[PDB]
Amino acid sequence: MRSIASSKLWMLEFSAFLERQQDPDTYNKHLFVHISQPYLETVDIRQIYDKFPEKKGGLKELFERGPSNAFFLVKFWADLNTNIDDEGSAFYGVSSQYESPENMIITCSTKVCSFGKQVVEKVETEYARYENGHYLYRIHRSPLCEYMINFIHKLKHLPEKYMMNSVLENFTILQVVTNRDTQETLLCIAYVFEVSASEHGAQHHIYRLVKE
Amino acid sequence: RSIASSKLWMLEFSAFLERQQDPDTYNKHLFVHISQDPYLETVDIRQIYDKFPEKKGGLKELFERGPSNAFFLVKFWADLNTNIDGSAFYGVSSQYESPENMIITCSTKVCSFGKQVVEKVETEYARYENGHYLYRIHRSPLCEYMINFIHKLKHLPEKYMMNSVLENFTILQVVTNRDTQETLLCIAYVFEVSASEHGAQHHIYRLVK
Ligand SMILES: O=C(O)[C@H](c1ccccc1)n1cccc1
């Protein structure tokens, strides 16, 4: 009730970044969004069904199947203050780490919704490595999908942050992590976005979704 | 004076939303509309290569092949003041005229923030009328990408925001003689949203080097 964790799986790290080679040896790594990990604040899941309305297979159906301790909402304030010109010397990447007390094979589903419609669905199977009494699932510098690279470039073309925020009111991502054998939902994370108001600095706020 | 080469000219072009209100009453909202003596203003085609499809088969290559008199830029102020909340038909219509009986190939490419997102290709056929030859597209369905795009623009709170988005949105239409492969007309389209009370408007330019 302190972090993005169920009984069987927890997020340690998540990041999306732009890495720009300045020299043969020297690199700038700009973090668009970044989580690295007292009680979490709570949000009743009915407050967010309007942004994730979906019928069959949707958030509501997933939540009702449970377990109710697997469901989180993350709000990101994305830092878009970075140069995106010189494409050749740029790598858009994602990294993440999860941890479990047991050796599971997991299925990770990511759905991106834009103005109501599902625009991307990515499904991957991940496998653990034993490390320090636990089982670790680690993605290191995987390429950011092209949709998201192009979305960032579109946001940055807008002349005012308030326009970026208007667009982002209609943008969500839903991540569902499932045990491949048991089909148990291990983690389900709903993500919403604004652009960070600050000149430089990504922020996040994590909530535990409830229904009480 | 108008969108015309030696071998083909546009008479009419429209995109519309038709909403049947009862058995005999319908609303027809025009998003954009051209119906057609001073000279057209000119635009250097190098200014617009970055907004259109480049590389093999791209605007630059097409322009250099010529003929140079076949190339036009149309700016639309699209009228988005209409209800888009079931009984609706989103449609496109157009008419062309030629002095010769050709089979024509119409290619339409939609480009969004650099990338080609839709390509449509159609073959159209002539009808003789009074020593010339007429081509007509009547109530062809607007592609799903464009409907949706309209619906997304209409969710935005401000027309200036809609116009910022539209700066990186273009459509390229290339009309070719199917048998000779001659370029008959090439029209680059760019967009703004029309202001309140305004309706649909357009401005036509002749692309040059
Ligand atoms: O979704 C799109 O492709 C674009 C858009 C998306 C993100 C930023 C700027 C424009 N759009 C169009 C209408 C609302 C957003």
Residue numbers in the entry:
A (entry chain B): 209 to 245, 253 to 427
B (entry chain A): 210 to 245, 252 to 300, 303 to 426
Quote what the paper states about this structure.
The Hippo signaling pathway and its components mainly function to control cell number and maintain organ size from early development through to adulthood. The downstream transcriptional machinery, which consists of YAP, TAZ (transcription co-activators) and TEAD (transcription factor), is the terminal effector of the pathway. Formation of the YAP/TAZ-TEAD complex leads to the expression of genes involved in cell proliferation and anti-apoptosis, such as Axl, CTGF, and Birc5/Survivin. More importantly, the YAP/TAZ-TEAD complex is likely a central effector of several converging pathways, due to crosstalk between Hippo and other signaling pathways, such as MAPK, Wnt/β-Catenin, and TGF-β. Hence, the YAP/TAZ-TEAD complex, specifically its protein-protein interactions, presents a formidable target in the development of new cancer therapeutics.
We determined the crystal structure of the hit fragment in complex with mouse TEAD4 to a resolution of 2.2 Å. The TEAD-fragment complex crystallizes with two molecules of TEAD in the asymmetric unit. The TEAD molecules are related by a two-fold symmetry, and a single fragment binds to and interacts with both TEAD molecules on the surface of the protein. Similar to the previously solved human TEAD2 structure, both molecules of TEAD adopt a globular structure, made up of a central β-sandwich fold and four α-helices on one side. After overlaying our TEAD-fragment structure with the previously solved YAP-TEAD structures, we noticed that the fragment fits into a hydrophobic groove on the TEAD surface. Specifically, the hydrophobic groove is made up of mouse TEAD4 residues Phe366, Lys369, Leu370, Leu373, and Val382. These residues form major hydrophobic interactions with the highly conserved LxxLF motif of YAP and TAZ. In addition, the two oxygen molecules of the carboxyl group of fragment 1 form important hydrogen bonds with the sidechain of Lys369 of both mTEAD4 molecules in the asymmetric unit. Therefore, due to the overlapping positions of fragment 1 and the highly conserved phenylalanine of the LxxLF motif, we propose that this hydrophobic groove is a druggable site for the disruption of YAP/TAZ-TEAD interaction.
